[PDB]
Write a protein that binds this ligand. Structure first.
Ligand SMILES: Nc1nc(C(=O)O)c(CCc2cccs2)s1
Ligand SMILES: [Zn+2]
Ligand SMILES: [Zn+2]
Length: 241
């Protein structure tokens, strides 16, 4: 407790660690959850991923702050004890990139969509060290994503932001929609202040079609859900046109 305003509440299978919560989703994948205190509003949860690939760890998204992001690094040290090779950050918003400085201090190599890096300062964020670029079909250009192990990085098109990207984990049932996807019971699409209302639905559908195998859809502001989250996000976006 650890009692949010937005996101998922605490449930069995979670493990608190400082101001953060971790939940194991598969033998080599964990969800990290960190909360931001907005006075007069309360605690907003954001979720990222931690992936063990052989003998290194790969991180998807920072926490809201450097301090929380260092805490993720200490949790990895305590529970995994393997070098953190890289992190991919999924768009230039505080919940996904607020802790870049913490990663760069610890020697972790960071990657973001080129557009995220160009947006980053405008959005109050530090840029990743390296820019991912994408084919017209949305798949990352492989030269720009070296040694990514099982991470399959897809740009689905503009949606929650124009720069939003997504990540599947090969050899698991998991794909990460980030802030693009909301849960199957959600009543809205979260913050649309930077959203592309015309193209959102196509981009949600493109996410689903790019990772057709995954059955566990992880997302930034809700607990992991089924593929229903994808079709539900897409219908809710259909109303935006
Ligand atoms: N930093 C923040 N990101 C989002 C987002 O939608 O990605 C926010 C809104 C959170 C909510 C999602 C669904 C209902 S509220 S805040
Ligand atoms: Zn965002
Ligand atoms: Zn968000």
């Amino acid at each position: 407790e650890i009692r949010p305003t937005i996101g998922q509440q605490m449930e069995t299978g979670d493990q608190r660690f400082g101001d953060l919560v971790f939940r194991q989703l598969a033998p080599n994948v964990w969800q990290h959850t960190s909360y931001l205190d907005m006075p007069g509003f309360g605690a907003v949860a954001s979720n990222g991923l931690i992936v063990r690939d052989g003998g290194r760890v790969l991180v998807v998204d920072t926490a809201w702050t450097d301090d929380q992001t260092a805490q993720i690094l200490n949790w990895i040290k305590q529970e995994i004890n393997l070098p953190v090779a890289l992190a991919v950050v999924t768009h230039a918003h505080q919940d996904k990139m607020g802790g870049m400085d913490a990663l760069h201090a610890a020697g972790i190599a960071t990657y973001a969509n080129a557009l995220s890096n160009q947006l980053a300062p405008q959005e109050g964020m530090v840029a990743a060290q390296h820019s991912l670029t994408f084919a017209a079909n949305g798949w990352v250009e492989p030269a720009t994503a070296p040694n990514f192990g099982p991470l399959k990085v897809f740009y689905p098109g503009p949606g929650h932001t124009s720069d939003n990207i997504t990540v599947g984990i090969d050899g698991t049932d998991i794909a990460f929609g980030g802030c693009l996807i909301k849960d199957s019971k959600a009543k809205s699409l979260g913050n649309l202040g930077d959203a592309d209302t015309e193209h959102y639905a196509a981009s949600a559908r493109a996410f689903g079609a790019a990772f057709p195998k995954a059955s566990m859809i992880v997302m930034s502001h809700s607990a992991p859900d089924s593929r229903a989250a994808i079709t539900h996000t897409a219908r809710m976006a259909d109303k935006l046109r």
